[model samples]
Target chain A: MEPTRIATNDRLSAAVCFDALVFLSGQVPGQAEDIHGQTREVLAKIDALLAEAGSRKERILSATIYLKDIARDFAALNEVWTQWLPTGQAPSRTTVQAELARPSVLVEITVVAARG
Target chain B: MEPTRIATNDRLSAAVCFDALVFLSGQVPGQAEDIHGQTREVLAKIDALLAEAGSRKERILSATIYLKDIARDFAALNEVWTQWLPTGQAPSRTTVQAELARPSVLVEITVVAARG
Candidate 1:
């Protein structure tokens, strides 16, 4: 086993080389705090985290998304997410509604990526 | 570094001494399918899993719960959970509404535990 390595980049974070699991920090829709913008912003950060972990969307194991307001953005958010993941290559995923760290941030996603 | 351990106890199971981390199976509300009975049944099961790991509720690192119907049973489920966990010993948690494999189960919880 390798020591769990945790690094938080200004925009993304990665914890890898332990149990073949990589836990990335939550990325929200945008830096400006609104849903659409934050969605785009967080997806970009996710790209960075995957690169840092030496993995990619097609390699995702699982994903957990938190929505500040599910009723408002679930569909819109899904549109962006579906396009990013490889067709039929999506990981097991769950989404929930809850209070978030910031008011303007509407969505946050945490991912787990692993390989054989 | 350590290997990730996996086990299944008839009523409880455990994986220990691996990365100082333990991932237990999901505990549902009960042996029966209904929410109220399953809540009591699963909490007892959680106790068994935690004990098998040489830890306790206070040692939990985080928890994730999936509910068959979030609208009806949130308060009742939380009431049982709050008492089971020690004061301020609760870990980061998330709950979501979703379909479950069994019709009777109202809740399912997965836990991560560690120690210094």
Candidate 2:
């Protein structure tokens, strides 16, 4: 099946939808100062993109969370994740520590969700 | 739909399949020393798991590659990736540098593929 690119640009699209599924690009915090702030920012972006693709956070099937400093920021990020994730609708998740695109970006998140 | 966890354990499973999609856990280099060797080893594991899920490389829809040192290992990793991926069936991909679970693990790869 051909994939329909959503919010396409030169480098990457904000999301891609195909076969009743929507895959989001890795989203990083824009100007958030701390891990909590950054995680919330990233999740908001995910929410918008999912909405644009006829999906929502509750429709998410899986998520991959990336942190720049796992030991220092994992708990802080989880606090936001636990709050942002909908009750009884949390997707399968995997979290890992990785050097983000920007030093200021403490967290990056990507997700796959059902498209209506 | 309930997710079928493949090779489940206390920490993580090697793979999970749901909704005609198979998601592989991040596969890291085992004993390989160089990026090329490590990448090859990681791809082999992915192939094995995909087979178990009734899929193959050509069925891959997207991939997320984690490099411990992007500047140092990106080219080497790409060289292997370019060869292993079937032509005209290459999936959308994103790569980034991250501090891996182990100091020796230079590359980690996770994939999403359609089940046959």
Candidate 3:
């Protein structure tokens, strides 16, 4: 089946929905450096993309979180994350420390959700 | 839609299926030292998880591979990965170097697949 793509660009689409699943490209922090602020910025983007795809954070099936410095950012990252996620609807999650594409990017989150 | 979670524990489930899509927890190398062997080991776990979820590698829609040392492992990891993936069904993929949960873990793979 052909996928319904949203906000396509040269590199990748902002979001793609196929076979009842919504796949979002990894989202980076916009202009924030602090882990909590950065996470807030990134999660907002995720919310918008999911909204465009007729899905919501509550429908997220899995999340992969990448941090530039897990040792320093994990705690603050979770502070914002737990606030953003719907209670009892948290997806299967994985977190790791990675050298991000940009030095200033403290976190990047990628998720898959069930599309309505 | 309600999610069908499999192998759940306090941290995460091994696999979760919702709305015709399956999301698998990251699979790590099983006592393999070399990148190729580690990738092979991790992929085997993914295969088993998918089988249990009524999916397969051929049905994979996306893959996120985390390498402990990209400079040393990227090439070898890809060599094994390309061979393992179905020729015409290669999904959207993203790879990055990350500090794994365990120091000895060289590779960890997580995937999303369409359920049969």
Candidate 4:
């Protein structure tokens, strides 16, 4: 099957669709002061990019969260994350501390959703 | 759809299968000394966990790779990764630096695969 690459930026596409699944690139924060702001922005960004692939956040099956600092930011990140997810709509997830590409990027979330 | 939780341990299941997809936890490396050894072991572990879900590595639709040190480990990880993949069977992937749950864990790989 042909893969559909949507929202192409200079470096890579935002989401790639194949096998009845949409795989999103790690969405990073644009300009958020702290973890809370950054997490919300990245999650919101995922919603938009998923839409471009004809899917939505609720359709997500799995997600991987990469935090720049797990110790300082886990709970704060989850505060927004838990709120962003609908009741009982949470996908299987794994969270780990990661050094993001940019110093300003606090969190990077990549997800795979069942395509609508 | 009801999720099938498989390979359960005290904290979480190794894989949760739903939406025609098997979502794996971050499979961390074992007693491997360096990146190459760690990557190989983790990939081998993924193969085992994927099997528990009635699937195999070739069926993976997407993968998220986390490294403790991307600059130091990316190439080595990819070296083992490329060899593990069957010809033209590479799935959509995202790689980033991540601090795993254990300090000894140099690499963690989680995947979403089409259920066979």
TM-score of chain B of each: 0.82, 0.96, 0.96, 0.95
Q: Write the per-residue lDDT of candidate 3 for residues B1-116, one digit (tens) a residue.
A: 77787786544578889877888888888888877889999999999999999899889998888988989989999999999988988889999888876678888888889999
Better of 3 and 4 by lDDT: 3
The C-alpha stretches of model 1 lying farther than 4 A from their native spots are A1-63, A66-116, B1-17, B32-34
Q: What DockQ, on C-alphas, does every prediction get?
A: 0.06, 0.17, 0.32, 0.23
Write model 2 residue lDDT over B55-109, tens digit each, in one string: 8876776778889887788888878988887754566466789767899999999
Q: Residue-pair clashes per candidate, as listed?
A: 12, 2, 0, 1
Cα RMSD (angstroms) for every candidate in the order listed: 7.9, 5.1, 4.1, 5.2
Per-residue lDDT tens digits for candidate 4, residues A1-116, read 99989978899998999867788998998788799999999999999988899788666766778888887888888789888886555776788986878888888998877777
Per-prediction fnat: 0.00, 0.12, 0.33, 0.27
- What is the lDDT for A7 in model 4? 77
Off by over 4 Å in 3: A1-13, B8-12, B30-41, B56-62, B74-96
User: Chain A TM-score per candidate?
Assistant: 0.84, 0.96, 0.97, 0.95
How far does residue B36 in candidate 2 sit from its true spot (Å)?
A: 9.9
Q: Which 10-residue window in model 1 chain B sums to the lowest lDDT?
A: B88-97
Of 2 and 4, the candidate ranking higher by TM-score = 4
lDDT tens digits by residue: candidate 3, A1-116: 99999899999998999888899999998888688899999999999999998789777888888888877888788788888877655677788887778888989998888887
Candidate 4, clashing residue pairs?
Answer: A97-B99
